[PDB]
Design an enzyme around this catalytic site. Structure first.
Site, mmCIF file in Angstrom:
data_model
loop_
_atom_site.group_PDB
_atom_site.id
_atom_site.type_symbol
_atom_site.label_atom_id
_atom_site.label_comp_id
_atom_site.label_asym_id
_atom_site.label_seq_id
_atom_site.Cartn_x
_atom_site.Cartn_y
_atom_site.Cartn_z
ATOM 1 N N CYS A 86 0.838 -1.229 0.000
ATOM 2 C CA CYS A 86 0.000 0.000 0.000
ATOM 3 C C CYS A 86 0.843 1.237 0.000
ATOM 4 O O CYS A 86 1.971 1.227 0.394
ATOM 5 C CB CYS A 86 -0.935 -0.036 1.182
ATOM 6 S SG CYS A 86 -0.068 -0.214 2.760
ATOM 7 N N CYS A 126 2.538 4.931 -1.630
ATOM 8 C CA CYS A 126 3.535 5.173 -2.665
ATOM 9 C C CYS A 126 4.904 4.635 -2.280
ATOM 10 O O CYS A 126 5.696 4.280 -3.161
ATOM 11 C CB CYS A 126 3.621 6.669 -2.969
ATOM 12 S SG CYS A 126 2.014 7.453 -3.169
HETATM 13 S S1 LIG Z 1 -0.238 1.624 3.590
HETATM 14 C C1 LIG Z 1 -1.678 1.420 4.674
HETATM 15 C C2 LIG Z 1 -1.443 0.201 5.560
HETATM 16 N N1 LIG Z 1 -2.683 -0.462 5.968
HETATM 17 C C3 LIG Z 1 -0.534 0.497 6.749
HETATM 18 O O1 LIG Z 1 -1.113 1.155 7.720
HETATM 19 N N2 LIG Z 1 0.697 0.150 6.819
HETATM 20 C C4 LIG Z 1 1.452 0.468 8.024
HETATM 21 C C5 LIG Z 1 1.547 -0.808 8.855
HETATM 22 O O2 LIG Z 1 2.126 -1.792 8.036
HETATM 23 C C6 LIG Z 1 1.984 -3.136 8.512
HETATM 24 C C7 LIG Z 1 1.495 -4.028 7.384
HETATM 25 C C8 LIG Z 1 0.237 -3.450 6.764
HETATM 26 O O3 LIG Z 1 0.257 -3.160 5.550
HETATM 27 O O4 LIG Z 1 -0.758 -3.287 7.495
HETATM 28 C C9 LIG Z 1 3.316 -3.678 9.008
HETATM 29 O O5 LIG Z 1 4.348 -3.084 8.631
HETATM 30 O O6 LIG Z 1 3.287 -4.693 9.738
HETATM 31 O O7 LIG Z 1 2.282 -0.563 10.036
HETATM 32 C C10 LIG Z 1 3.640 -0.132 9.793
HETATM 33 C C11 LIG Z 1 4.263 0.072 11.153
HETATM 34 O O8 LIG Z 1 3.555 1.097 11.856
HETATM 35 C C12 LIG Z 1 3.677 1.142 8.941
HETATM 36 O O9 LIG Z 1 5.035 1.438 8.611
HETATM 37 C C13 LIG Z 1 2.847 0.968 7.675
HETATM 38 O O10 LIG Z 1 2.757 2.195 6.943
#
Ligand SMILES: *SC[C@H](N)C(=O)N[C@H]1[C@@H](O[C@@H](CC(=O)O)C(=O)O)O[C@H](CO)[C@@H](O)[C@@H]1O
Ligand SMILES: *SC[C@H](N)C(=O)N[C@H]1[C@@H](O[C@@H](CC(=O)O)C(=O)O)O[C@H](CO)[C@@H](O)[C@@H]1O
Lengths: 138, 138
Positions: free
Chosen positions: A47, A49
């Site tokens: 997800c 960019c």
């Molecule tokens: S890009 C939107 C996404 N749902 C998200 O919030 N990502 C954050 C999240 O990532 C986790 C995996 C996931 O896609 O949910 C992960 O890395 O385990 O949490 C991390 C850590 O806070 C963030 O760096 C991500 O943007």
């Protein structure tokens, strides 16, 4: 999302990266690396960019640089949660995705968090990876 | 940028897309398609977040959908300027990159501009491509 995630994973596995998709696979891989080898880890993401920036830079530098990591592996954050959590036990940093880790043996020598990728020119990301491999890889 | 662009191009050519890198190659390809075939064109880009969204969606749908284009080709905007300009003569739309075009024979039947990609969830982009292939491809 199914076909999308496999393409994002395939971008790495079609270019030499080993996909580690269970906790057991990560333990078996990381606990068996040689003490003198370098292991580059791409923590992949579906997800935003930043994820789209992290894949090309990692493939280009890890496969073309003069100084290249001995091993190239990836865990897919969100998609493969148990594998990603176990890799993060070896990294011992604040969790983020996408992110990069470089090991010498089992010791972390370089880490790039999401916040250093987001909004960064892809050429500049590649340059940091080149610097990290040059300093740490044979 | 050299190794980066080739990786972004390789993401497509490692998954069935033909790279058209000169004006002559585009003319020779597009002027030789059969009238009943469908031709999907990815106009690639190196920069911004939209480019990183456009590649995975295009690869996933064009290689996995039930209704798939007969032909898959790409021109690289910015990198291969003459090829991109000649393809845009066949498209006859406002120029943007990344962008998508779908042909039946030499007639444009579907176009997605950059502004419909930028800031869009990758799953939603893939869905529009699925709809366009379903409506127009055998
Ligand atoms: S890009 C939107 C996404 N749902 C998200 O919030 N990502 C954050 C999240 O990532 C986790 C995996 C996931 O896609 O949910 C992960 O890395 O385990 O949490 C991390 C850590 O806070 C963030 O760096 C991500 O943007
Ligand atoms: S992403 C920043 C980039 N320099 C840019 O401005 N791209 C715009 C430009 O793209 C051209 C190729 C290039 O990368 O320079 C092109 O498509 O020929 O112009 C198009 C059309 O206005 C824009 O859609 C791009 O964002």
């Amino acid at each position: 999302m199914k076909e999308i995630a496999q393409q994002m994973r395939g971008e790495l596995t079609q270019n030499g990266f080993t996909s580690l998709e269970t906790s057991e696979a990560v333990s078996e891989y990381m606990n068996q690396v040689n003490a003198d080898d370098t292991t580059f880890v791409v923590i992949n993401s579906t997800c935003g960019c930043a994820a789209g920036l992290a894949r090309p830079a990692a493939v280009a530098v890890a496969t073309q640089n003069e100084h290249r990591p001995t091993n190239t592996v990836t865990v897919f954050a969100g998609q493969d949660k148990e594998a990603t959590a176990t890799m993060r036990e070896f990294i011992q940093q604040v969790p983020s995705s996408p992110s990069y880790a470089l090991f010498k043996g089992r010791d972390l020598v370089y880490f790039m968090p999401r916040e250093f990728i987001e909004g960064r020119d892809i050429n500049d990301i590649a340059m940091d990876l080149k610097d990290a491999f040059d300093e740490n890889c044979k």
